[PDB]
Amino acid sequence: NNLDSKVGGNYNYLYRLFRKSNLKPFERDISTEIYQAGSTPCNGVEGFN
Amino acid sequence: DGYFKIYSKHTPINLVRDLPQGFSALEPLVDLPIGINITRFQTLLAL
Amino acid sequence: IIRGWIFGTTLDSKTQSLLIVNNATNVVIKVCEFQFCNDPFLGVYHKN
Numbered sequence: 001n002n003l004d005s006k007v008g009g010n011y012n013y014l015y016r017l018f019r020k021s022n023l024k025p026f027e028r029d030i031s032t033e034i035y036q037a038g039s040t041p042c043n044g045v046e047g048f049n
Numbered sequence: 050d051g052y053f054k055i056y057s058k059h060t061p062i063n064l065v066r067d068l069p070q071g072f073s074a075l076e077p078l079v080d081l082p083i084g085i086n087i088t089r090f091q092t093l094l095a096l
Numbered sequence: 097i098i099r100g101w102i103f104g105t106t107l108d109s110k111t112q113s114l115l116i117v118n119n120a121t122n123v124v125i126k127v128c129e130f131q132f133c134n135d136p137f138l139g140v141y142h143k144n
């Protein structure tokens with residue numbers, strides 16, 4: 001914190017928030033394509049669900 | 050488990066058009082800490 | 097005539113992937129967000 005925390009919020013540190021299935025041990029995932037949370041198909045950069 | 054491995058052998062043969070019936074084991078060669086999802090591969094011959 | 101292999105799961109810069117190649121000067125091994133050719137190969141000039 002005493003090095004890292006920024007008073008405005010240090011938005012440079014992120015975690016993957018959703019994934020379709022748990023990852024195998026020591027797998028790294030760089031795919032940032034939009035998570036289809038709903039029963040809908042979904043495409044483009046944004047949508048409901 | 051996130052680690053990629055290679056093993057190999059080379060041997061002299063005299064067979065015209067099929068894999069030779071015989072037995073020989075392969076020694077290990079390399080370990081590569083790649084940590085990536087592989088599900089397919091593709092050979093590079095030269096032209 | 098064999099030189100090496102691609103290994104991966106999308107092969108078009110969506111997911112990181114592995115290149116292994118024994119070229120005329122050295123072997124190269126590399127793990128990167130590659131966009132691979134539709135038909136990868138190593139070309140050789142061979143004239144008479």
Ligand SMILES: *[C@@H]1O[C@H](CO)[C@@H](O[C@@H]2O[C@H](CO)[C@@H](O)[C@H](O)[C@H]2NC(C)=O)[C@H](O)[C@H]1NC(C)=O
Pocket residue numbers: 023024027086087088105
């Ligand atoms: C490694 O990558 C492949 C390709 O993206 C994944 O295979 C897919 O798995 C899901 C399972 O629900 C299916 O929707 C796809 O149709 C599969 N595709 C193929 C070509 O089989 C694989 O799941 C990934 N591995 C991990 C650990 O996430």
Ligand SMILES: *[C@@H]1O[C@H](CO)[C@@H](O[C@@H]2O[C@H](CO)[C@@H](O)[C@H](O)[C@H]2NC(C)=O)[C@H](O)[C@H]1NC(C)=O
Pocket residue numbers: 119120121122124
């Ligand atoms: C074989 O492929 C490798 C990787 O592209 C080539 O290595 C490069 O060689 C030049 C000249 O020595 C250097 O400037 C680069 O820094 C090297 N790249 C790396 C990643 O080391 C090699 O030259 C290729 N062989 C031939 C015959 O072209």
